[PDB]
């Protein structure tokens, strides 16, 4: 592991997001910032909000520059409105550099901030194409690379605890690592396998095959990427296109049929509980997603366990049962490989080589009988046809 200063710099959990400490302005104002590979705007609360105990105070920064322009950013979940400007930004547990970056000062928001998440802003790590108002607003990572010698690559190790973290525990617990400019080998086991970034907007990838316990879901692979497939740390769940979700749920139900779960569970809205330590992991299937490889006609697969797709939640009675929510849900905007999937792997966003790497995470949750996996190669033909074209 060669990036010790950045190892263990994240906090949070899948249900509320993973965040990194950043500083903005002069003198530096410390803020916790949501790591979001599914958007491209750097934005921080800049006005009082019931869920914020701190916010960016522009009038206290000698390096603040007003762009005299408003900005509106709508996400699937919620939205915010703000005022554009630039200021000096640093990451305390990151690369020892300070850069001048665009910052949207959030003045109004709806369903954006999360009560108790401990974060006050968002770091959109995707490409300028999807930046608001338009692609001329340079994203933070682009500025970082242009202004310093930091390699055009970052990697994420999101660490799910495998159990509920109460308010105090989640504040004192290490939630993972964001390695800026490199790959830290202590964070994964086995080999890194790379899939091409199909196009530089979201971190778009192509899924070529899906298995539930080794059984082919057997759908036209274009359905898996309808209308796109993305890697998104800013979404909790694995979200699947309607038809794929329906097929996957039918197959996961069939594999786990020795126990019947209520419809509310499969809808991802209701928790299920087991007596302490008795969660029947073995009745739930593993899920394998095959991704386009970098070699012609070659693919590889990433395999996740129910310890990834069943999200630990506190029992509404706070008892001693082990409880979970089903973290796979339906999408109308393509596949979203969210945080619960990322928790099984060390994910390398190799922007310089236009590829995303996956390796088994050194912090993934598993049992004595099964482990997450990244395996290859597999002969796979006509993978280009798996991509969707509007
Ligand atoms: C992560 C904590 C729990 N959480 C948010 C609160 C329930 C989710 O799991 C979640 C669920 C859905 C269905 C969408 C998004 C979502 O829109 N996430 C965005 C980031 C985000 C927004 C927000 F407003 C609160 C928050 F924390 C995180 C991504 O940028 C997402 C936006 C999407 O916008 C398309 C218009 C494109 C893909 N990436 C996030």
Curated annotation (Swiss-Prot):
Induction comment: Up-regulated by the Ca(2+)-regulated transcription factor NFATC4.
Similarity comment text for this entry: Belongs to the peptidase A1 family.
GO CC annotation terms, alphabetical: axon; cell surface; dendrite; early endosome; endoplasmic reticulum lumen; endosome; endosome membrane; Golgi apparatus
Role, per record: Responsible for the proteolytic processing of the amyloid precursor protein (APP). Cleaves at the N-terminus of the A-beta peptide sequence, between residues 671 and 672 of APP, leads to the generation and extracellular release of beta-cleaved soluble APP, and a corresponding cell-associated C-terminal fragment which is later released by gamma-secretase. Cleaves CHL1.
Domain Peptidase A1: from-to ranges: 18-359
Extracellular side: 1-390
Record's keyword terms, sorted: Acetylation, Aspartyl protease, Cell membrane, Cell projection, Cytoplasmic vesicle, Disulfide bond, Endoplasmic reticulum, Endosome, Glycoprotein, Golgi apparatus, Hydrolase, Isopeptide bond, Lipoprotein, Lysosome, Membrane, Palmitate, Phosphoprotein, Protease, Signal, Transmembrane, Transmembrane helix, Ubl conjugation, Zymogen
Source species, domain of life: Eukaryota
Modified residues (N6-acetyllysine): 69, 218, 222, 228, 242-243, 250
Catalytic residues, chain numbering: 36, 232
Summary of activators and inhibitors of this protein: Inhibited by RTN3 and RTN4.
Shown stretch of the complete protein: 58 to 447 of 501
Modifications after synthesis and translation: N-Glycosylated. Addition of a bisecting N-acetylglucosamine by MGAT3 blocks lysosomal targeting, further degradation and is required for maintaining stability under stress conditions.
UniProt free text on domains: DXXLL motif is required for a proper endocytosis and retrograde transport to the trans-Golgi network, as well as for regulation of lysosomal degradation. The transmembrane domain is necessary for its activity. It determines its late Golgi localization and access to its substrate, APP.
Protein name as catalogued: Beta-secretase 1
The EC number(s) this enzyme carries: 3.4.23.46
Record field: catalytic activity: Broad endopeptidase specificity. Cleaves Glu-Val-Asn-Leu-|-Asp-Ala-Glu-Phe in the Swedish variant of Alzheimer's amyloid precursor protein
Tissue: Expressed at high levels in the brain and pancreas. In the brain, expression is highest in the substantia nigra, locus coruleus and medulla oblongata.
GO molecular function, one term: protein serine/threonine kinase binding
Subunit structure: Monomer. Interacts with RTN1; RTN2; RTN3 and RTN4; the interaction leads to inhibition of amyloid precursor protein processing. Interacts with SNX6. Interacts with PCSK9. Interacts with NAT8 and NAT8B. Interacts with BIN1. Interacts (via extracellular domain) with ADAM10 (via extracellular domain). Interacts with SORL1; this interaction may affect binding with APP and hence reduce APP cleavage. Interacts with NRDC AND NRG1.
Origin species: Homo sapiens
Glycosylated residues in this chain: 96, 115, 166, 297
């Amino acid at each position: 592991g060669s990036f010790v200063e950045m190892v263990d710099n994240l906090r949070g959990k899948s249900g509320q997001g993973y965040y990194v400490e950043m500083t903005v302005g002069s003198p530096p104002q410390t803020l916790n910032i949501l790591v979001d590979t599914g958007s491209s705007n750097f934005a921080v609360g800049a006005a009082p909000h019931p869920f914020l105990h701190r916010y960016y105070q522009r009038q206290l920064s000698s390096t603040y520059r007003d762009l005299r322009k408003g900005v509106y950013v709508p996400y699937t979940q919620g939205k915010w409105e703000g005022e554009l400007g630039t200021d000096l930004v640093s990451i305390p547990h990151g690369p020892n550099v300070t850069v001048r970056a665009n910052i949207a000062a959030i003045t109004e928001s709806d369903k954006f901030f999360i009560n108790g998440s401990n974060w006050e802003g968002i770091l959109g790590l995707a490409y300028a194409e999807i930046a608001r108002p338009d692609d001329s607003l340079e994203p933070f990572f682009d500025s970082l690379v242009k202004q310093t010698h930091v390699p055009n690559l970052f990697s994420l190790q999101l660490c799910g605890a495998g159990f509920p973290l109460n308010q105090s525990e989640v504040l004192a617990s290490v939630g993972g690592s964001m390695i800026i400019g490199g790959i830290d080998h202590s964070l994964y086991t086995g080999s890194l396998w790379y899939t091409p970034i199909r196009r530089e907007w979201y971190y778009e990838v192509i899924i070529v095959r899906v298995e539930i316990n080794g059984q082919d879901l057997k759908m036209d692979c274009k359905e898996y990427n309808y209308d796109k497939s993305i890697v998104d740390s800013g979404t909790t769940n694995l979200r699947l296109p309607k038809k794929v979700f329906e097929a996957a749920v039918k197959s996961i139900k069939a594999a786990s049929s020795t126990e019947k779960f209520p419809d509310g569970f499969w809808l991802g809205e209701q928790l299920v509980c087991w007596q302490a330590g008795t969660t029947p992991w073995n009745i739930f299937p593993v899920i394998s997603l095959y991704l386009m490889g970098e070699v012609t006609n070659q693919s590889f697969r990433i395999t996740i366990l129910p310890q990834q797709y069943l999200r630990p939640v506190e029992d509404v009675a706070t008892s001693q049962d082990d409880c979970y929510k089903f973290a796979i849900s339906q999408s109308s905007t393509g596949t979203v490989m969210g945080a619960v999937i990322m928790e099984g792997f060390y994910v390398v966003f190799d922007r310089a080589r236009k590829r995303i790497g996956f390796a088994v995470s050194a912090c993934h949750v598993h049992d004595e009988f099964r482990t997450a996996a990244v395996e290859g190669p597999f002969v796979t033909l006509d993978m280009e046809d798996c991509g969707y074209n509007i």
